[PDB]
Each structure stands twice: as structure tokens, then as C-alpha cells.
């Protein structure tokens, strides 16, 4: 019946592949039942089997992408699909450190000129 991704999170790659194959075989059997005048009770399981396949694929992809992200976390250049998907303009923006960069003249101006805190009596 309805699988639990919480349980699936503990299986291995081979086990998940085997379970996916079993679910696909069950779906094929249900399609055969559909075509050969199957009962409504049988036909009602197609949605459950399809969503079970979806859950298995979700777990597989999540595990694979987590592993790849860990592997490439330290590389200077990462695969395009592992980079941050913000807006195009946000990606083209300057980095925080580059924005924080200041020239020698600017640093000297910051040192010398500095606004104070004051109040004016009415």
C-alpha cells in the first residue's frame, strides 16, 4: 500500500531500485487489468501505485543530490545544477565581500571623517 518515505530514507540504492521495479511491475499488472475489463476495486489501486513510484523516485533523487552536494561543497567550480538558483540578476550581482571592498582613499576618509552623536537644545 502507501509507502512511507520516512522508512524509505533508510534503505540502500539497490533496495530502492528493486522496490521501484516491483512497483512498476504492479502498475503494469494493473494496466492489464484495466484493459481486460478489470474491477473498480482493482482500478482504484493505480493511483496508489503511481504515487508510490513517485515517492521512491523522490527518495532516490534526494539522496543522490545530497551526496553530490556534499562531494562538491568544497570545489571552486561546481556543476551548473548544484549552484544557487536565485534570479538571473541576483546571480549577476556583486558578492558581499566585493561590495564591502573599499579603496585606500575611502578607508582614510572613514578614519578621519566620522559623524558624531549630538543634540541641540531648543
Amino acid at each position: 500500500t502507501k509507502l512511507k518515505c520516512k522508512s524509505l530514507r533508510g534503505e540502500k540504492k539497490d533496495a530502492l531500485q528493486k522496490k521501484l521495479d516491483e512497483q512498476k511491475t504492479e502498475l503494469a499488472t494493473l494496466r492489464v487489468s484495466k484493459v481486460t475489463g478489470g474491477a473498480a476495486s482493482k482500478l482504484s489501486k493505480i493511483r496508489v501505485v503511481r504515487k508510490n513510484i513517485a515517492r521512491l523516485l523522490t527518495v532516490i533523487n534526494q539522496t543522490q543530490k545530497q551526496e553530490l552536494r556534499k562531494f562538491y561543497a568544497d570545489h571552486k567550480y561546481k556543476p551548473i545544477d548544484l549552484r544557487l538558483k536565485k534570479t538571473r540578476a541576483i546571480r549577476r550581482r556583486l558578492t558581499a565581500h566585493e561590495l564591502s571592498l573599499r579603496s585606500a582613499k575611502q578607508q582614510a576618509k572613514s578614519r578621519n571623517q566620522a559623524v558624531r552623536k549630538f543634540a541641540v537644545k531648543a
Binding site: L84, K86, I90
Partner: protein, 88 residues
């Protein structure tokens, strides 16, 4: 003889379906779409065609990516984080 007699000779299409807009306005001999301008890189729109612009403008379709971006902006385009690990 213009009219009924001449209408019997109309069996060669001058326009076909366009790859970009799906309209039957692609001129075969000119190799250009009379509606969207394919294969021109840019899109065909004229300010005198206000109703045409309204018909073919953004928002008349699905705007799947635009809606996705609008939804994601509401939380600052946060990535690499998941909801607090909890249960039922």
C-alpha cells in the same frame, strides 16, 4: 469569372502552422510567421494592434516560472535549508 467559379480553384495553402505560436499563419514561400514574426529573433508586436498585444501578451498563458519566482520571493529566495525537523 470572379466568384463561385473562381472559388473552386482554391486548394493550395498559403499559410501553415507556426512552430513558435502554433497559429496557421506561417507563410510557406516567405518562410515567416505573419503573427509572431518567426523565425525573426524578436517578437512581432505593434502599438496600433492594441487588441493583438492584449491577446498575445504575458499572463494569457501559464506563467509557470514567473509564478514560481513570485512564490519564492516571498521568503527571500532561501535555498539549502529545510523546515525544522519535526513529526506529526
Amino acid at each position: 469569372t470572379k466568384g463561385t467559379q473562381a472559388f473552386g480553384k482554391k486548394h493550395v495553402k498559403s499559410h501553415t502552422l507556426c512552430k513558435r505560436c502554433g497559429k496557421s499563419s506561417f507563410h510557406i514561400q516567405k518562410k515567416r510567421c505573419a503573427s509572431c514574426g518567426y523565425p525573426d529573433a524578436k517578437k512581432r508586436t505593434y502599438n496600433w494592434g492594441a487588441k493583438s498585444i492584449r491577446r498575445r501578451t504575458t499572463g494569457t498563458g501559464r506563467t509557470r516560472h514567473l509564478r514560481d519566482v513570485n512564490a519564492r520571493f516571498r521568503n527571500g529566495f532561501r535555498e539549502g535549508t529545510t523546515p525544522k525537523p519535526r513529526a506529526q
